[PDB]
Design a protein around this ligand. Structure first.
Ligand SMILES: *Cc1cc2c(cc1C)nc1c(=O)[nH]c(=O)nc-1n2C[C@H](O)[C@H](O)[C@H](O)COP(=O)(O)OP(=O)(O)OC[C@H]1O[C@@H](n2cnc3c(N)ncnc32)[C@H](O)[C@@H]1O
Ligand code: PRO
Ligand code: PRO
Ligand SMILES: [Cl-]
Length: 379
């Protein structure tokens, strides 16, 4: 028996477990694998954190809280957590809602940003070649998280404080009562007062076992690392992280760290998949490499060398691409964290705090109604 069980000890679940353990709550975390791992949504080494938020100005306080928590984690562990690369956002002037909302978000929250146009972009960051009609907003104080190290650090800190992590154990079913929760696995059954459910892409398959019917679609999302001109694209010469809008969608990427090569993903396209049958080999579809080189040859031509490494990862999308962070509508002793829609990792520190509050008290300090499980746009 525990105070709290966390099912899925990944990005959100491990952060929640640390928050609980820190408060002396007796916590069990259960995971299908041994986090961090390459079967979920957290691998590929690096994750962008932005504060000025093109998906919506209402995420900014959560972003800023999460950033402060990431600096706190850096101080507590020997693992590397965060590098302040800055984040460049650009797109054609007048033709990117994402860029426009990034700019509005920065204004509304008085964030520190630089605004640039056309050739100014290419001049400031050798290696970038945008058309003259593009504009940009650069956020100097955001950057890059080392996501596998984040999970490892939270795990080690939680375990030192008495959290138990049961690895390689799939939760197969749930039994919820008014006064207790139970999970069923092939390695045994466990009970607690409260449950947090954070199974990433598997939320789309297993939330039905809690009598929930929520549209959730897992997507197969690849990234690649490319041999690059290190005099232009290295973190050592202040090449930024980036998230940009071009006519054919949104691309994102990372400077080369220690010669790993520039890393690139295509955000707005992926294959609809089931997490149990996804093909986790990079390059099995022509789109995997070709969509990436299409961007590199046009906008970052010195980073379009040999493919050094590929990875395959999953998003879990809601209809509105906003998260789900709430109590179960029928069971106040069950907390749901789902649907992070390809943009949740940067918030995992702050979400851990929210989940711990919801589990312990049934409430949170600030409104999180944008992530309500009851909202119309979910259905
Ligand atoms: C895939 C991806 C995502 C991504 C990104 C690039 C790629 C290629 N870039 C990002 C970026 O730069 N910045 C950012 O803020 N987010 C970015 N993302 C998205 C982000 O990585 C995800 O939103 C986030 O990782 C989601 O976290 P969540 O905690 O929901 O998912 P998870 O880490 O995969 O953890 C789920 C765990 O649950 C376990 N599991 C699943 N089923 C079970 C059962 N039945 N029993 C027990 N455990 C279970 C999994 O094993 C996993 O550990
Ligand atoms: O495919 C998609 O993105 C949406 C998300 C939930 C269900 N369908
Ligand atoms: O959430 C982010 O910042 C990155 C860029 C789009 C995909 N994930
Ligand atoms: Cl996701």
């Amino acid at each position: 028996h525990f105070d709290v069980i966390v099912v899925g000890a990944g990005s959100m679940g491990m952060a929640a477990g640390y928050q609980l353990a820190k408060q002396g709550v007796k916590t069990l975390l259960v995971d299908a694998f041994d986090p961090p791992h390459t079967n979920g949504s957290h691998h590929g080494d690096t994750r962008i954190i932005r504060h000025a938020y093109g998906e919506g100005r209402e995420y900014v306080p959560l972003a800023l809280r999460s950033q402060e928590l990431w600096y706190e984690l850096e101080k507590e562990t020997h693992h590397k957590i965060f590098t302040k690369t800055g984040v460049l956002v650009f797109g054609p002037k007048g033709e990117s809602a994402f860029v426009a909302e990034t700019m509005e978000a920065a204004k509304e929250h008085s964030l520190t940003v630089d605004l640039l146009e056309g050739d100014e972009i290419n001049k400031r960051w050798p290696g970038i070649t945008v058309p003259e009609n593009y504009n940009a907003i650069f956020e100097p104080n955001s950057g890059v998280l080392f996501s596998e190290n984040c999970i490892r650090a939270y795990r080690e800190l939680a375990e030192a404080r008495g959290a138990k992590v049961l690895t390689h154990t799939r939760v197969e079913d749930f039994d919820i009562s008014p006064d207790s929760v139970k999970i069923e696995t092939a390695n045994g059954s466990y009970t607690a007062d409260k449950l947090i459910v954070s199974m990433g892409a598997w939320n789309s398959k297993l939330l039905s076992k809690l009598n929930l019917d929520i549209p959730l679609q897992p997507y197969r999302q690849v990234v690649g690392f490319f041999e690059s001109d290190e005099s232009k694209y290295s973190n050592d010469i202040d090449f930024p992280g980036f998230m940009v809008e071009v006519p054919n969608g949104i691309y994102y990427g990372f400077p080369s760290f220690g010669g790993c090569g520039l890393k690139l993903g295509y955000h707005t396209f992926g294959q609809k998949i089931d997490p149990d049958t996804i093909n986790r080999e990079f390059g099995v579809y022509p789109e995997d490499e070709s969509n990436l080189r299409a961007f590199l040859e046009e906008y970052m031509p010195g980073a379009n060398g040999e493919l050094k490494r590929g990875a395959v990862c999953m998003y879990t999308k809601t209809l509105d691409e906003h998260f789900i962070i709430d109590l179960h509508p029928e069971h106040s002793n069950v907390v749901i964290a789902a649907g992070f829609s390809g943009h949740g990792f940067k918030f995992s520190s702050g979400v851990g705090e929210v989940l711990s509050q919801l589990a312990l008290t049934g409430k949170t300090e600030h409104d999180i109604s944008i992530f309500s499980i009851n909202r119309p746009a979910l259905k």
